[PDB]
Amino acid sequence: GEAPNQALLRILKETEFKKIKVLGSGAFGTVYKGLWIPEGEKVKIPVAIKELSPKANKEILDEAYVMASVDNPHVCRLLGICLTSTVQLIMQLMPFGCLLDYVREHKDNIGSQYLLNWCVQIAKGMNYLEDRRLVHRDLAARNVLVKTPQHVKITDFGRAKLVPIKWMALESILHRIYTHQSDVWSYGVTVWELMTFGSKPYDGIPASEISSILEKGERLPQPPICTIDVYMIMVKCWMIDADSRPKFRELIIEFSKMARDPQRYLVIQGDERMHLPSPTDSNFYMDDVVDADEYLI
């Protein structure tokens, strides 16, 4: 009756890592860019260090539990924790930040190939979470991070289980019902954010008016770049009947077929003549630096 979770929680010494600069800050605490230099290993791993009252410590340890329990190319895993006066989460540095800020800042160089591929990768990551019986409950473009422009990962397990109104399924707003199918709704909203190059969903409408608006049948509008093929997918993610919504495995298939002929599915001016940084560029990436994805003890 439910499988033992044999994930390893790695406790890291404070002396093993250094903080370089602040990446972000909120009520939770601060996230630092850093380097992890294990034992006598001759490796430097670029890391994001989340630094943090008894309840805040329980919530960070709950997120640490979930984050240490995942292992997929399209999901962010916990590298370890540091037990100092303040508890720190050691995660992989995602050097291009969140996908939301990336689509806003690089809009003039984002072609249909990148957009459709990001959709496939998010669906792959989400399908993995589903296989793991994990309901994210906070999927949004802000919680998809960019390792490279061609590789994105889902993160922020602070709400994950075995309030973001504008990304939530109607059952979730009204009854607090969360399933893999309620994550599919959030997936649809995330796709809309990517296709509109980071527009705010239902901008100006207060969160208390969203449930009423959804009940009448109003949905997010068709982004200008989206063909009816792409929009019809987003719309199916926003059906009232949760079981009528597509499954993540089907979203992988649908977006993959589209990623094979991207210009037939997304209409972007100057598409294919657009350039984004890749690991085959000068000064893209300093001795003994190894990405967390290749550091496997």
Catalytic residue list: 138
Residue closest to ligand 4ZR when measured from CB atoms: 24
Q: Is 156 in the site for ligand 4ZR (CB under 6 A)?
A: yes
Q: Identify residues 213-252 at the interface with ligand 4ZR (CB under 6 A).
A: none
- 76 CB-near residues (< 8 Å, 6+ apart): 67, 70, 91, 92, 94, 145, 153, 154, 155
Cβ proximity to ligand 4ZR: between 97 and 164 the closer is 97
Options 89-97, 129-137, 276-284, 288-296: segment touching ligand 4ZR (CB under 6 A): 89-97
Q: Rg of the Cα trace of the chain?
A: 20
Q: Shortest Cβ distance from residue 34 to ligand 4ZR (Å)?
A: 10
Cβ proximity to ligand 4ZR: between 121 and 155 the closer is 155
Q: Is 48 in the site for ligand 4ZR (CB under 6 A)?
A: yes
Cβ proximity to ligand 4ZR: between 94 and 103 the closer is 94
Q: Is 189 in the site for ligand 4ZR (CB under 6 A)?
A: no
Q: Is 50 in the site for ligand 4ZR (CB under 6 A)?
A: yes
Q: Is 190 in the site for ligand 4ZR (CB under 6 A)?
A: no
In sequence order, what are the beta bridge partners of 11?
A: 81
8 Å CB contact between 84 and 118: no
Q: Is 140 in the site for ligand 4ZR (CB under 6 A)?
A: no
Return the H-helix or E-strand segment holding 195: helix 180-195
Compute the distance between CA of residue 141 and CA of residue 154 in angstroms, rounded to an integer.
Answer: 9
Quick note: the x/- pattern for ligand 4ZR over 8-47, rule CB under 6 A, is ---------------xx---x--x----------------
The string over 158-167, giving b where at least 16 C-beta atoms fall within 10 Å of a residue's C-beta and e elsewhere, is bbbeeebbbb
Compute the distance between CA of residue 46 and CA of residue 20 in angstroms, rounded to an integer.
Answer: 10
# binding residues, ligand 4ZR (CB under 6 A): 16
- 146 CB-near residues (< 8 Å, 6+ apart): 94, 95, 96, 97, 98, 99, 102, 152
At 172, which amino acid appears?
S
Options 53-61, 87-95, 177-185, 277-285: segment touching ligand 4ZR (CB under 6 A): 87-95
Cβ proximity to ligand 4ZR: between 261 and 293 the closer is 293
Q: What share of the chain is helix, strand, coil (3-state, %, to 5)?
A: 40, 20, 45
Cβ proximity to ligand 4ZR: between 63 and 254 the closer is 63
Q: Shortest Cβ distance from residue 260 to ligand 4ZR (Å)?
A: 30
Q: For 148-180, give the DSSP string.
A: ETTEEEE---TT-B---GGGS-HHHHHH----H
Q: Shortest Cβ distance from residue 20 to ligand 4ZR (Å)?
A: 11
Q: Is 145 in the site for ligand 4ZR (CB under 6 A)?
A: yes
In the chain, DSSP finds a helix count (H) and a strand count (E) of 8, 7
Q: Is 76 in the site for ligand 4ZR (CB under 6 A)?
A: yes
Q: Please identify which residue in 94, 99, 120, 170 interacts with ligand 4ZR, judged by CB under 6 A.
A: 94
How far CA 197 is from CA of 15, 135, 273, in Å, comes to 41, 26, 18
Annotate 226-258 with three-state secondary structure. Answer: ECHHHHHHHHHCCCCCHHHCCCHHHHHHHHHHH
Query: Where do contacts with ligand 4ZR occur on this chain (CB under 6 A)?
Result: 23-24, 28, 31, 48, 50, 76, 91-94, 97-98, 145, 155-156
